[PDB]
Design an enzyme around this catalytic site. Structure first.
Site, PDB file in Angstrom:
ATOM      1  N   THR A  23      -7.738  -5.238   5.578  1.00 24.30           N
ATOM      2  CA  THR A  23      -7.622  -3.991   5.592  1.00 24.30           C
ATOM      3  C   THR A  23      -8.270  -3.498   4.072  1.00 24.30           C
ATOM      4  OG1 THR A  23      -5.597  -3.677   4.248  1.00 24.30           O
ATOM      5  CG2 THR A  23      -5.627  -3.437   6.751  1.00 24.30           C
ATOM      6  N   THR A  24      -9.107  -4.476   3.563  1.00 25.79           N
ATOM      7  CA  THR A  24      -9.871  -3.922   2.378  1.00 25.79           C
ATOM      8  C   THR A  24     -11.001  -4.785   2.386  1.00 25.79           C
ATOM      9  OG1 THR A  24      -9.260  -5.725   0.551  1.00 25.79           O
ATOM     10  CG2 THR A  24      -7.968  -3.721   0.910  1.00 25.79           C
ATOM     11  N   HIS A  34       0.861  -1.328   0.045  1.00 28.66           N
ATOM     12  CA  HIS A  34      -0.073  -0.002   0.055  1.00 28.66           C
ATOM     13  C   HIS A  34       0.877   1.358  -0.030  1.00 28.66           C
ATOM     14  CE1 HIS A  34      -3.558  -2.580   1.345  1.00 28.66           C
ATOM     15  NE2 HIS A  34      -2.553  -3.454   1.705  1.00 28.66           N
ATOM     16  N   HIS A  36       2.674  -5.755   2.976  1.00 31.61           N
ATOM     17  CA  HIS A  36       1.763  -6.847   3.565  1.00 31.61           C
ATOM     18  C   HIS A  36       2.340  -8.433   3.158  1.00 31.61           C
ATOM     19  CE1 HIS A  36      -1.056  -4.062   4.789  1.00 31.61           C
ATOM     20  NE2 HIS A  36      -0.176  -3.873   5.564  1.00 31.61           N
TER      21      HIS A  36
END
Ligand SMILES: COc1ccc([C@H]2OC(=O)NC2=O)c(OC)c1
Ligand code: NA
Ligand SMILES: [Zn+2]
Length: 258
Positions: free
Chosen positions: A196-197, A94, A117
């Site tokens: 996180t999405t 990200h 990640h």
């Protein structure tokens, strides 16, 4: 689902299709280094990537994923807070439009330029899709990127990006060694959280390394040339693909280091 990172479809909107967006163990979070407590019970962390087999790199319209062969225990993460064996399936990043933003986790509210990640799944659940339905199904190793000196081990990634500019493009990406993306120290923070999405599932043990890696301005500039859009569609640069920090709620962040 048409989620993304813009004004109209960004993180403030996600809760309408994915109500768990407002759940009790959402990620990322701010790591307050003065509140996180050293935990003597944490076993040593074991990153065993010697037999890793990368296959392919994919622009999925949200990030680019470097995918691994996870049909057997090649590259695994064990130890630390983890019980059992977690298999590497993919890594991605990200990042921001500018060097002052891009990471999902923050450290005393500090945002880094990017965050890597490395995603692993608990082999006691047999496959990844079963693992994401479990509270201990994934272990994500998170590594901050700051802009400074180039990271030589990243340059093979940077150089394939112009072959996967747009959403749905992929390229063969064999013999990539993810050990070249690690910092020297494995000192970490850990806490229970989520993807996180979307779908935002609350299935992750987060392990966030304290030591960032340095990458060059040129390297991260090449990340920002990717596109969220598909080929032939209006160009929307793939930048600011990060979710902001979420409420810590009833969680403690533990440090592996005194
Ligand atoms: C289907 O597999 C997924 C889906 C989402 C995430 C998101 O959660 C995160 O931390 N970064 C992400 O892109 C993921 O990564 C663990 C894996
Ligand atoms: Na703080
Ligand atoms: Zn991620």
């Amino acid at each position: 689902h048409h989620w993304g990172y813009g004004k109209h479809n960004g993180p403030e909107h996600w809760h309408k299709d994915f109500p768990i967006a407002k759940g009790e163990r959402q990620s990322p979070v701010d790591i307050d280094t003065h509140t996180a407590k050293y935990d003597p019970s944490l076993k040593p962390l074991s990153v065993s990537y010697d037999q890793a087999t990368s296959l392919r790199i994919l622009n999925n319209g949200h990030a680019f994923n470097v995918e691994f062969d996870d049909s057997q225990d090649k590259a695994v993460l064990k130890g630390g807070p983890l019980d059992g064996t977690y298999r590497l399936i993919q890594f991605h990043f990200h990042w921001g439009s500018l060097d002052g933003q891009g990471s999902e986790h923050t450290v005393d509210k500090k945002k880094y330029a990017a965050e890597l990640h490395l995603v692993h799944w608990n082999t006691k659940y047999g496959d990844f899709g079963k693992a994401v339905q479990q509270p201990d199904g994934l272990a994500v190793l998170g590594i901050f990127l700051k802009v400074g000196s180039a990271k030589p081990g990243l340059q093979k990634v940077v150089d394939v990006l112009d072959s996967i500019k747009t959403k749905g493009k992929s390229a063969d990406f064999t013999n990539f060694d993810p050990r070249g993306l690690l910092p020297e120290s494995l000192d970490y923070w850990t806490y229970p959280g989520s993807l996180t999405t979307p779908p935002l599932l609350e299935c992750v043990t987060w392990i966030v390394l304290k030591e960032p890696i340095s990458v060059s301005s040129e390297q991260v500039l090449k990340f920002r040339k990717l596109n969220f859009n598909g080929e032939g569609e209006p160009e929307e640069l793939m930048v600011d693909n990060w979710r902001p920090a979420q409420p810590l709620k009833n969680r403690q962040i533990k440090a592996s280091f005194k």
